[PDB]
Design an enzyme around this catalytic site. Structure first.
Site, short mmCIF file in Angstrom:
data_model
loop_
_atom_site.label_atom_id
_atom_site.label_comp_id
_atom_site.label_asym_id
_atom_site.label_seq_id
_atom_site.Cartn_x
_atom_site.Cartn_y
_atom_site.Cartn_z
N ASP B 8 -15.55 11.95 15.88
CA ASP B 8 -14.94 13.26 15.75
C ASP B 8 -13.51 13.02 15.23
OD1 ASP B 8 -14.46 16.03 15.95
OD2 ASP B 8 -13.97 15.93 18.09
N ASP B 10 -10.47 15.54 15.80
CA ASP B 10 -9.52 15.95 16.83
C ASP B 10 -9.83 15.29 18.19
OD1 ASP B 10 -7.13 17.76 17.12
OD2 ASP B 10 -8.39 18.64 18.68
N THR B 122 -16.59 16.67 11.88
CA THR B 122 -15.52 17.47 12.47
C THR B 122 -15.67 18.96 12.26
OG1 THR B 122 -13.11 17.88 12.28
CG2 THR B 122 -14.13 16.76 10.41
N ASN B 123 -15.25 19.75 13.28
CA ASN B 123 -15.13 21.19 13.23
C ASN B 123 -13.71 21.41 12.73
OD1 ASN B 123 -17.73 21.75 14.27
ND2 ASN B 123 -16.99 22.61 16.19
N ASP B 184 -14.75 14.00 21.97
CA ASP B 184 -13.91 14.26 23.14
C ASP B 184 -14.36 15.54 23.89
OD1 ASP B 184 -12.84 15.85 20.97
OD2 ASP B 184 -10.94 16.07 22.04
N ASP B 334 6.38 -14.56 -9.35
CA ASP B 334 6.21 -15.70 -10.25
C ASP B 334 6.73 -15.40 -11.67
OD1 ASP B 334 4.94 -18.49 -10.55
OD2 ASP B 334 4.02 -17.31 -12.14
N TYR B 465 4.96 -19.80 -21.27
CA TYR B 465 5.73 -21.05 -21.11
C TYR B 465 6.21 -21.66 -22.40
CZ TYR B 465 3.59 -21.62 -16.39
OH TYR B 465 3.17 -21.49 -15.10
N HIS B 523 2.88 -20.36 -2.28
CA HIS B 523 3.20 -19.75 -3.57
C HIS B 523 2.52 -18.38 -3.81
CE1 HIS B 523 4.18 -19.27 -7.75
NE2 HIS B 523 2.88 -19.08 -8.01
C1 LIG Z 1 13.43 -22.32 -16.09
S1 LIG Z 1 13.36 -20.92 -14.95
C2 LIG Z 1 11.60 -20.91 -14.75
C3 LIG Z 1 11.05 -21.60 -13.70
C4 LIG Z 1 9.69 -21.61 -13.52
C5 LIG Z 1 8.86 -20.92 -14.39
O1 LIG Z 1 7.47 -20.91 -14.26
C6 LIG Z 1 6.92 -20.37 -13.03
C7 LIG Z 1 7.46 -18.99 -12.69
C8 LIG Z 1 7.08 -21.31 -11.85
C9 LIG Z 1 5.70 -21.63 -11.36
N1 LIG Z 1 4.80 -21.42 -12.48
C10 LIG Z 1 3.53 -20.91 -11.96
C11 LIG Z 1 2.63 -21.95 -11.38
C12 LIG Z 1 1.32 -21.51 -10.81
C13 LIG Z 1 2.41 -21.97 -9.89
C14 LIG Z 1 5.42 -20.32 -13.23
C15 LIG Z 1 9.41 -20.25 -15.47
C16 LIG Z 1 10.78 -20.24 -15.64
#
Ligand SMILES: CSc1ccc(O[C@]2(C)CCN(CC3CC3)C2)cc1
Ligand SMILES: CSc1ccc(O[C@]2(C)CCN(CC3CC3)C2)cc1
Lengths: 546, 546
Positions: B8, B10, B122-123, B184, B334, B465, B523
């Site tokens: 229920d 209420d 429920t009512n 209830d 990250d 990267y 992480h």
């Molecule tokens: C130079 S400042 C900088 C430092 C780290 C970076 O890369 C990351 C944010 C760190 C870890 N990596 C991910 C991994 C799976 C764990 C990405 C990028 C720039």
């Protein structure tokens, strides 16, 4: 020969010039003439203001530097600064006071519509003030209307430096002689002039626009009222929610603030709200323009029962559930207007406010079958033609471009009588094979509807009419109720199917009902009269729905 | 044998029982005992309250009827009602005071996780009060956690009528003996008992739950703290915005209020925020969880330059432009945390507030090349392995289930040393071919990441990267700036790559910086410690970001 128009922001696209506040502040404070405008440009190229305009520092880092320059300038001037002096207070007020110069924007819009590349070139800053949103909002609104926005603080260059003009020409992909440049600062105009660009010193808007039409050969001054901003389908945020295993609903989304859910009619699309979407978002609302079940990118199951009002309303609640919305204001037109009244009657806790264009709220008659009700009105005879599955689908799917061109017309352009569709035996019997193009739509807009209806056709859309008995029995459950949530009924003078007099008894079931009325408006309200629809909706939203 | 649990609303799923306010009002007003509880049930089956509970009338139509019943009851009782009496005032307060009974919901959640079908019976009423949203919000929150919600006002039937119990059994597709029913009100329990269902009279929650665990054989009382609500990908609203001709960004959207844009890291997804999305929406925010460029349903162009920070940030601004948002609060983890600091540095007018999980803000070193910077830290050596296009892609794409299972592990479950990936010549060299399943994830959750990465692979993600020199030169433009907008740095004790001490100098560039810290957290912050991430973020959002 010109093919590009460049506009400054301060004193050109936005007024009053934020710069003009230093002189106004001096006069209001009886400080020596030019003291504040001087502290502002202290050091010139390596002064605080240039570093701000180049993006080296933020606006909040600049405020203390400006105050130091005000002290130094005051010392030399032999004057004392007032006790409660605040550069932040002065600049906060100047920025918030500055608004878009509407006729200057209109001219930029007209040039772009005529094939001109348009750009904003401005000396601006990185605004990190607690009140930065007002400026962000102004920039977001202005920028959408131009091909390019070039900001000094982002490009690390400043007007009058020659590099910024060469950068501008490179981004425009135009030779200087093809470019009109409009600026309120003579010194910032000169490098564009030296390069051979057409330049306009802007003092008053009217003279500036007179100079602009003489130079472009395009009328920009005393021009008709333009249409509201429309939507380019490919520039919208498109959303998708699965409401049940076989059903997904598509919507277009724009803006922030209270949720406003737009519900189209038959045989339409989310795009039927194209003139409303940008305006309602600009007004401070989060617009969700649906593709109703059976339409466009939404699911279109074949079964008739999938389109009864009860199921349609339940899915719209599920749509709100899945998006995480406790409420939305529901605005409907035509069949969407019918769904919207029923959303208010059955799910009032989920409906913030309710508004309908053309469609009145008519309760179920318990003493008359829906067939017996269609018996009374000759107006609704075409709905009997829609009953037999497959028949209307064939005629409407036969030629899509013909279907939409014949339907979507203003009150004075009608090629369809929706009378004796029973006698005639079709919707387009004594109708042209190649209807002219209505003044309401472009060929491009017709082809969008054509492309949308190629996916599912007319089965799902026509099924909305095949639930008469089911909708009547469901509506009979609400016969003891009243709509007591905020409500708006918008009538259209020249809608010969959903006539304004059909709404005359609404106050008996909706006592606090608000109204709007559009003269010389046919059935296709949103595209027939966009400016007025927008004015009516925004006014009602700001007064009745948060 | 039980396989369904019915609750229920209420007095069962929500407390204090709204009904209990009539007795409390009587005592507070020194009115005769039962006067108000009596006016409430006047007429029984054809009385005002039954008609309300069946959906014949709305709550606002019911208020005047209740007041008339209060007068009639008072007359018979030989008492006078107080001068400033208001049924609306009393009911408004009772409804707003009623909150979800958290341990009762936890038990319903545990039963469902164990394979039980769960329902709310429920009512209730059709709420059209100006304050209806508080109730709508409670219903939306509760309902999502159950298989069915059966409301009297929608089904036109009421407890204790036998028809509602037969309806319940039919919707459950269960024989009465397979159903526990918790209520209830003893009178509303009896028809379920007569049919042979297991019934529980609920007074205090603890006894009710004791009766429930004895009857189901499932522990529901004194149970561990459950994980926050997660996301079922197919039940989310999915959004798509084209930011430029070849690039579209996908996001998941939930809730209403200030926009909160969630930015994942490498090699992740929007789904990495699964425990945050429902919680942040429930907290009063509009969550936009991105698939970052190169990931899931977002575009993944092959070119390296498409992934430099400058381009990534420009597209995120375009994303805001197209959705019609002047600002959003940016929360990143990250690589997403890195983008988020740069959004604050370059576009402060568009960033409401900024928060990062694990990733500190580190400014560019103008006196050291990014290669020379990686030279200092052995921690970042695997990033050199990521430089050569095609190499890491091959190893990471080789076996997807292995890739995600090896990466996504808690601090104590590590199978990857991310050291001497240069010596080793791979990320998974002395790593198992069939890694065990981490306690953080289900096999199902791993397969979601596997399915997402099948579309584009690792090229786009690894390209984040490959822009070291470009990102360094761009970051050098911001060397004179400070982050002065609201900011949060959340450190994770056991993140051995993004160590908390790497954030030690942040206050030099972000003076007003707020902080959070999570102990025994690796992480993968969001799934490692969801409850604490949610507590830290909600607290900071409510204090610093509207
Ligand atoms: C130079 S400042 C900088 C430092 C780290 C970076 O890369 C990351 C944010 C760190 C870890 N990596 C991910 C991994 C799976 C764990 C990405 C990028 C720039
Ligand atoms: C019995 S109450 C009712 C009345 C009309 C109705 O259908 C419409 C809303 C009227 C016009 N028709 C659309 C045509 C393209 C113009 C749909 C549905 C229910």
């Amino acid at each position: 020969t010109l093919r590009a128009a460049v506009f400054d922001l301060d004193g050109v696209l936005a007024l009053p010039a934020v710069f003009g506040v230093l002189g106004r502040t001096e006069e209001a404070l009886a400080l020596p003439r030019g003291l504040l405008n001087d502290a502002f440009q202290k050091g010139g190229p390596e002064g605080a203001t240039t570093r701000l305009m180049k993006g080296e520092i933020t606006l909040s880092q600049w405020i203390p530097l400006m105050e130091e320059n005000c002290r130094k300038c005051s010392e030399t001037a032999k004057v004392c600064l007032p006790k409660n002096f605040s550069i932040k207070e002065i600049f906060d007020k100047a920025i918030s006071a500055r608004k878009i110069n509407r006729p200057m924007l209109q001219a930029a819009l007209m040039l772009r519509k005529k094939g001109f590349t348009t750009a904003i070139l401005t000396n601006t800053w990185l605004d990190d003030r607690a009140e930065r949103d007002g400026l962000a909002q102004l920039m977001c609104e202005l920028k959408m209307h131009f091909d390019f926005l070039i900001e000094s603080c982002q490009v690390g260059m400043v007007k009058p430096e020659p590099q910024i003009y060469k950068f501008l020409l490179d981004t425009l992909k135009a030779s200087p002689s093809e470019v009109v440049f409009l600026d309120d600062i003579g010194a910032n105009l000169k490098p564009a002039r030296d390069l051979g660009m057409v330049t306009i010193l802007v003092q008053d808007t009217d003279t500036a626009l007179k100079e602009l039409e003489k130079v472009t050969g395009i009328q920009l001054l005393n021009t008709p009222a333009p249409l509201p901003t429309s939507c380019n389908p490919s520039d919208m945020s498109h959303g998708y929610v699965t409401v049940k295993p076989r059903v997904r609903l598509h919507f277009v989304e724009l803006g922030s603030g209270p949720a406003v859910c737009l519900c189209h009619g038959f045989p339409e699309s989310w795009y039927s709200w194209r003139y409303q979407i940008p305006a309602l978002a600009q007004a401070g609302y989060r617009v969700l323009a649906m593709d109703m079940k059976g339409y466009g990118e939404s699911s279109a199951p074949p079964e008739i029962e999938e389109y009864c009002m009860e199921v349609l309303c339940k899915e719209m609640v599920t749509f709100l559930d899945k998006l995480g919305l406790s409420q939305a204001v529901f605005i409907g037109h035509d069949w969407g207007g019918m769904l919207v009244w029923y959303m208010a009657l059955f799910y009032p806790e989920r409906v913030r406010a309710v508004a309908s264009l053309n469609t009145p709220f008519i309760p179920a008659n318990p003493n008359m079958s829906p067939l017996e009700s269609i018996k009374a009105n000759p107006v609704f005879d075409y709905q009997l033609y829609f009953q037999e599955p497959g028949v209307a689908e064939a005629e409407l799917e036969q030629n899509l471009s013909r279907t939409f061109k014949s339907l979507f017309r203003a009150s004075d352009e009608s090629v369809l009588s929706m009378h004796k569709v029973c006698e005639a035996g079709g919707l387009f019997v004594n109708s042209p094979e190649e209807p002219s193009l209505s003044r309401m739509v472009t060929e491009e807009e017709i082809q969008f509807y054509v492309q949308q209806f190629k996916k599912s056709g007319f089965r799902g859309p026509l099924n909305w009419y095949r639930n008469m008995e089911r909708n009547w029995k469901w509506a009979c459950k609400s016969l003891g109720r009243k709509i007591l949530i905020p409500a708006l009924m918008v009538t259209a003078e020249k809608d010969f199917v959903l006539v304004p007099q059909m709404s005359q008894h609404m106050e008996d079931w909706i006592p606090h009902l608000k109204r709007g009325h559009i003269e010389d408006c046919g059935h296709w309200t949103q595209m027939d009269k966009p400016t007025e629809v927008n004015q009516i909706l925004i006014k009602w939203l700001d007064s009745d729905a948060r």
